[PDB]
Design an enzyme around this catalytic site. Sequence first.
Site, PDB file in Angstrom:
ATOM      1  N   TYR A  23      81.403  20.022  49.766  1.00  0.00           N
ATOM      2  CA  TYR A  23      81.764  20.568  48.489  1.00  0.00           C
ATOM      3  C   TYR A  23      81.514  19.595  47.361  1.00  0.00           C
ATOM      4  O   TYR A  23      82.033  19.767  46.308  1.00  0.00           O
ATOM      5  CB  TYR A  23      83.213  20.969  48.491  1.00  0.00           C
ATOM      6  CG  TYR A  23      83.513  21.903  49.610  1.00  0.00           C
ATOM      7  CD1 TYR A  23      84.495  21.622  50.529  1.00  0.00           C
ATOM      8  CD2 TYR A  23      82.773  23.060  49.775  1.00  0.00           C
ATOM      9  CE1 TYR A  23      84.744  22.477  51.566  1.00  0.00           C
ATOM     10  CE2 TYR A  23      83.014  23.908  50.811  1.00  0.00           C
ATOM     11  CZ  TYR A  23      84.002  23.605  51.696  1.00  0.00           C
ATOM     12  OH  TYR A  23      84.245  24.446  52.727  1.00  0.00           O
ATOM     13  N   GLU A  70      92.515  23.368  56.191  1.00  0.00           N
ATOM     14  CA  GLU A  70      92.466  23.382  54.737  1.00  0.00           C
ATOM     15  C   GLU A  70      93.879  23.238  54.203  1.00  0.00           C
ATOM     16  O   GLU A  70      94.806  23.881  54.708  1.00  0.00           O
ATOM     17  CB  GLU A  70      91.840  24.669  54.191  1.00  0.00           C
TER      18      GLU A  70
END
Lengths: 520, 520
Positions: free
Chosen positions: B62, B145
Amino acid sequence: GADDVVDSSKSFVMENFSSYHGTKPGYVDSIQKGIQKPKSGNYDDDWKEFYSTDNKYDAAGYSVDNENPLSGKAGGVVKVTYPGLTKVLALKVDNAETIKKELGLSLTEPLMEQVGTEEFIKRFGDGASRVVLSLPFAEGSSSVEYINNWEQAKALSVELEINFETRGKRGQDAMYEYMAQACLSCINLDWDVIRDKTKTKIESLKEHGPIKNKMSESPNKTVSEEKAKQYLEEFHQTALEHPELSELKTVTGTNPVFAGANYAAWAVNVAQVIDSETADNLEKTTAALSILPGIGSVMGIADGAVHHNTEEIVAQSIALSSLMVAQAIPLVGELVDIGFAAYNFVESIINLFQVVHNSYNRPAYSPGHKTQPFLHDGYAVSWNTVEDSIIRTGFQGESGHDIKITAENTPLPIAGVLLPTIPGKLDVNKSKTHISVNGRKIRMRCRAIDGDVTFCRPKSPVYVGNGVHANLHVAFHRSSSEKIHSNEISSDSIGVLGYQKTVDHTKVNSKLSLFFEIKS
Amino acid sequence: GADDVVDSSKSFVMENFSSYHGTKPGYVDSIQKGIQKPKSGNYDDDWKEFYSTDNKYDAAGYSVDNENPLSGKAGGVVKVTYPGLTKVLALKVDNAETIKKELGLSLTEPLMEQVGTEEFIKRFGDGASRVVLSLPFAEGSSSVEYINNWEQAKALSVELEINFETRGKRGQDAMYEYMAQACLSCINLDWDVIRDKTKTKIESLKEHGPIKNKMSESPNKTVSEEKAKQYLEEFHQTALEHPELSELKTVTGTNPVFAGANYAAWAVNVAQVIDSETADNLEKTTAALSILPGIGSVMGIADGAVHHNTEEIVAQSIALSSLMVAQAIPLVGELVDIGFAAYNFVESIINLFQVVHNSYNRPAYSPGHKTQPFLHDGYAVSWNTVEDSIIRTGFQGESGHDIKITAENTPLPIAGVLLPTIPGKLDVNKSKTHISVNGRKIRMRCRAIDGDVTFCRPKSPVYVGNGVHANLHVAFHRSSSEKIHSNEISSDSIGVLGYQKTVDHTKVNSKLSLFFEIKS
């Protein structure tokens, strides 16, 4: 608990409980004297039983000659009735050990044995004279299968529903005309008409100058497979020019599956696997023909639809296939009489038509609906679960929707995805929408197209293939509790986009559709 | 209940709980001053949050430039640590309404808001200074996450894990070399070596007499696509003769995916979609190349395996692809400098290699294992559920196993199925084994082959296709409680047999494999 193995809602009690049993030729009269266990000689001691069903048309499928199961004669269906009151007990599982343990019965005696004892039935019969178990017939079916304790089945009264051999039709026509009563339009063709039209068309086609001349042209010798296909392709092109084939010609052009090359390859394939012994025996012919690829060309079946849907077109395609196979037999070998093309070839393929027409006449999910995959251009996509394919409406909040994606061999790209949207009632949550590739979570960039479509592309390149699969997760958000109205949406599918190709001089992505249903 | 939305086993408390966050170029230093909510402008009020993860290598994905997400620079990864004690609460679902209702919290305030309030955390923190939610990173992943309340995230301490731009490598090489540390052999190649070897091989190939002559031979004009492919195919055949390509030649022959026709089609396709504006911009080149089919030919990836698995072979394939694309550009158009073949073509395709190598380096199920389908010859088969793929052993009794079967378009036959068997420990129940075709239940006839295989054929012909699907149900019976031993079985798969074809002058059925695991 017992509710883990028994469904009380579908259990019930009936007076004069009747069901149906398919009966092989030679036993249609003898079975009507009484149900009796056959002589000795199985796979599960717990599952010894006499089988029946609620659907006389399913029962008709178990009536074919056991020594010629593909192509032999069908006996008939009998109706079997219990006098008095019967408790039908519906099961949720078909595992004898689980059923025995959860129903508090003995695990040392076959299930079906205990079902027939006075104890078990005073206990579960709710005042019934006997107990019959029920199970789901099969996946994709709503029929019911009944499992009868043999002894208790001695009580059954048996009568005739249909004798297929009394109708006196050719092949298995009576059986399949009967099954067709189990009810895209429908294919319910008259196969006596088709057979007569086929013989007539073959005789009539063989007397045309151009076709006769083409016949002469044949090498009429064993030759290479590519030469044979070229000649057969030529022959097909010749015959389709004649007016008795006009309807066929018109369907022929609407689809490459129907082109002459595919008929030629089918006819060559047939001639290659039919030797003289096989040609003389309908069952052996049918077993051989039934494992060949390409039969949809002769059947006019492509894209989920039966395009040869009238007695006229079907007879034309069978006529033409017959004369092509007659042409292909001497081009592959020397020891087989071409009479096969007119006799058992036509008889067998008629049988295969009826099997496949029977399949298309049954309810089924189309590709991309519920959990049936959409297969296309080497990709497979599907809804992960059935609930994923439902977009609920009429509430504020979110939902998530999982789509499995992969490809058959080399790496193929996923370009993005076309999604429905409606302001307020169905917005894409672009934070929670993503595609996971072998567990690598890739986020998306999305833009609106018109007003009812959002197009999202991955932020890293996505490829799938043998060993690389993806999960597309679509998150929708609903700011209004107003119900979606079926014209705020212009498609009923999510469009996964695969690789770029040119379709009629325009660049487009391979389209992989997942059909959804708006509900609630 | 709360256990419906929270997993107490994977919840925990930690002192100095650290996790990782991917950071875009230009923010690697500024983020280390502190975590702060960006300026205004989302998709779900309940899900406002700062995101981190337990896997620094996932976090690295990311970190790429948002304005050039496919091909741009990656910033780095920072490690973010909470001082004190944090309660990580693991969730079972990601639906804010369900989580709010089941945890007895207010349904009027965003979930993530309440997670950050002193109330909610005295109540769920078990003595923690803050509460961080956890979720499964993605399907196919074991990563975690973390969802951080912004305010509470002000407390985070931030430091550098890796700055990708300080490594000073070309393209995204640092990011992917880093991700490769997340651990068929493995592809962990040195891409500086590959780039240097590629430039060297291109220069050196261009100075050969035969290749130079082939170059002259080119029309060097816009010409039809088939003519271009023919010339490119010729060129490929010429270049592969030269010793700097010897390894490539050897892999080339082992697989038709690698033949010159497929390189030619790829090179033509590339030249067709690359205009002058696109050629000058790496991101636009990458977006265009990434949606083309056929890249496995250049990558040497087929059948689930990366065959171009050394820096030498990869550089040879990229070198050759580069000079083919240089040859194809003037054969499709006049307005594009062939410098694209040496510059952004090589830069972009190197990037695509790294993406796909990254996918193959991640754990994943092969076709036919668990619920991944086996796709082959137009069929798709798969285990209905994961438990279906497990054959339990060491008990007397039965099991059943469901296999979904369909095909992509026209009707294709299912000839039968090859099953494992072991006397006593694993026998086929031939009464309960069947195949259901759009709900028509078709029974089987089975015979033993050798001692460990049972071959079953349907008693009516089975076809599948668009709109016709099947469920193969396999019932095994176990008369012994002795555990199956892994050499009483000679294959680890059930073999569904499709249509008959000839493979190297022998007639065989298309083979569709469902891999099972013996357990317990």
